[PDB]
Design a protein around this ligand. Structure first.
Ligand SMILES: O=C(O)C(=O)N[C@H](Cc1ccccc1)C(=O)O
Ligand SMILES: O=C(O)C(=O)N[C@H](Cc1ccccc1)C(=O)O
Ligand SMILES: O=C(O)C(=O)N[C@H](Cc1ccccc1)C(=O)O
Ligand SMILES: O=C(O)C(=O)N[C@H](Cc1ccccc1)C(=O)O
Ligand SMILES: [Fe+2]
Ligand SMILES: [Fe+2]
Lengths: 336, 336
């Protein structure tokens, strides 16, 4: 949609020139009120929606590098680096299988004050490197910050968890990123409530059934759950169906909360020239399995089946490397 | 090898002109004595071999249409028909899934005397149709025939079953076929002892690892376990790897016993212009699973894994028809 207008006539929140350009078409994601029945409907049907008045992270809306560094306590925060705007999320617990894989992003633990310094350093030296802080909110958090945390709207979110019959909140990540930073398309196996705090983030989502268009890496690969297709330079040779992809986009700002249904693909980028961005997500385990499979199956359920096959086949063969050969042996001249 | 010579200088048992011609190369299967250590070795390593002095079906060597019709009792025998020399073995318990499948062979129960008549009829009327009797040896068998059965060398075969740790004899089929009759390539999940009684049969076998060259039908298909490749007119377009196939052949005659290891492909044909052929097989369940998978895996073990995947995937999807689509969705642009 068109750039929303800020109250008090402070001008447009952002402008098209801050968004990156891509080859596929997109339609806006609904921006509704938490009290709007249609929104309660979209969630109930595992469809994305942006809630604008939940007050989920109200106490955190005052956060910023300064305030944070002062009260965030003194613990270790994981900080990812990148020579480019695209951040390569890789699982270190799978690098064994694909020894032929070399990471294009380096993680590093550090104190907040350090992170801030390393950041103010780049900016103050006309560098080109980019950073991104992603750390769970444990107990090593300052006292004052714990006050803000307790300030979150748990009354509302706890009812969503209940009404939807989801599992237990697995974690909350604090995400602080630099403008221009990008998180390549991928999907997560948990329900997510993306709570925007500082800055603006453009989020482009794709339904689970778009599986054939996004070509995710093999399950045993370090980049499992991520799309192999380079959005900046799509290889229609290897990934022919990326020319059929159609997504849903929107730009979340301070106070907004985006619901990302489990298994839904999502590409997230921080607006160009929009200062830093701060967000806090809420990951919950999806509702348990009906124990009485009812057909027809939903798209994400099939993806669960595929993932399973790959996992079990790598067990049987005792080697994840042979998973591919066996699958081709199974299909060539028989199923294709 | 070259046509063996019959004792008493009765001339060659058969001549090349009786065998069908095929595009692939083949090497002879070992013809050894049951007391030969090398033969006990081939069996222990699940490799084919022809034993010439087991005396397994000694009492049955005197069988023929006449003697049989008289003592075979009076029960129902399954008799398959075919307009061509190739017999289409289809599973009636799977015809549901592939309703788009129409059998090219008609089975029919009948009394022996009837079978003989229907047979002597064709021959006596210059017909072209072909028949093949395949029936288990139950209790509806004549008394005199039971005497022959009891005459089999159970002392020897029971030790093979024991030494190899195989399961229990699942069944014994009486196979009576017309000259020129052919049983297309396929494999069985049980250990087999092919006991030739009357006539000569050419058997061409392929190791389990030739899976990629024989393109078996889908597991849920009525012709599961059978090769899709037409040996008389190979379609190298669909089945490219059939040009890499290499088999082991041999011609079994009265008194010979062929060991067909479980999962080994086999094409069986009755010599051209060689009268009828009578055989009796012995199917045993392979040795149980080690319960402690020891790698590297053997070829037939992987085929067991593939079969499993197909079976379970058709369960999960609740429809065997979608098995193919999902497999391609899994591999395209990811594993190929
Ligand atoms: O949406 C589905 O249920 C489905 O089977 N979709 C397939 C593609 C697909 C298959 C499996 C998972 C996701 C997507 C299709 O050809 O449309
Ligand atoms: O919240 C998410 O699910 C998510 O993908 N967040 C990304 C950052 C991220 C990347 C990888 C793992 C967790 C979080 C973002 O740029 O907002
Ligand atoms: O023989 C094997 O163990 C094996 O994995 N053979 C594969 C082909 C094959 C795979 C699985 C079963 C039978 C045959 C090959 O490319 O040679
Ligand atoms: O004994 C076998 O395994 C076998 O494939 N015998 C075939 C006949 C047959 C075909 C199908 C099922 C059982 C038996 C033959 O022509 O000798
Ligand atoms: Fe994510
Ligand atoms: Fe067979």
């Amino acid at each position: 949609g068109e750039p929303r207008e800020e109250a008090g006539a402070l001008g447009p929140a952002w402008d098209e020139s801050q968004l990156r350009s891509y080859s596929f078409p997109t339609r806006p994601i609904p921006r509704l009120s938490q009290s709007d029945p249609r929104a309660e409907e979209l969630i109930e049907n595992e469809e994305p929606v942006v809630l604008t008045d939940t007050n989920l992270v109200y106490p955190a809306l005052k956060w910023d590098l300064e305030y944070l560094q002062e009260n965030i306590g003194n613990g270790d925060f994981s900080v990812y680096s990148a020579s480019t705007h695209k951040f390569l999320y890789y699982d270190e617990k799978k690098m064994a299988n694909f020894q032929n894989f070399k990471p294009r992003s380096n993680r590093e633990e550090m104190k907040f004050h350090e992170f801030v310094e390393k950041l103010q350093d780049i900016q103050q030296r006309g560098g080109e490197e980019r950073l991104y802080l992603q750390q769970t909110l444990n107990d090593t958090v300052g006292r004052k910050i714990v006050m803000d945390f307790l300030g979150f709207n748990w009354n509302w979110i706890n009812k969503q968890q209940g009404k939807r019959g989801w599992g237990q909140l697995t974690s909350n990540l604090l995400l602080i990123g630099m403008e221009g930073n990008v998180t390549p398309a991928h999907y997560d196996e948990q329900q997510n409530f993306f709570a925007q705090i500082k800055g603006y983030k453009r989020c482009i989502l794709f339904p689970p059934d778009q599986f054939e268009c996004l070509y995710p890496y093999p399950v045993h690969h370090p980049c499992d759950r991520q799309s192999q297709v380079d959005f900046d330079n799509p290889d229609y040779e290897r990934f022919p169906n990326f020319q059929n992809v159609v997504g849903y986009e929107t730009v979340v700002g301070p106070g907004d909360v985006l619901y990302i249904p489990m298994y839904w693909w999502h590409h997230i980028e921080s607006l160009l020239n929009g200062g830093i961005t701060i967000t806090v997500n809420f990951w919950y385990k999806g509702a348990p399995t009906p124990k009485r499979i009812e057909y027809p199956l939903k798209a994400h359920q099939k993806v669960a089946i595929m993932r399973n096959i790959e996992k079990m086949l790598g067990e049987a063969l005792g080697n994840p490397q042979e998973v591919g050969p066996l699958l081709n042996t199974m299909i060539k001249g028989r199923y294709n």
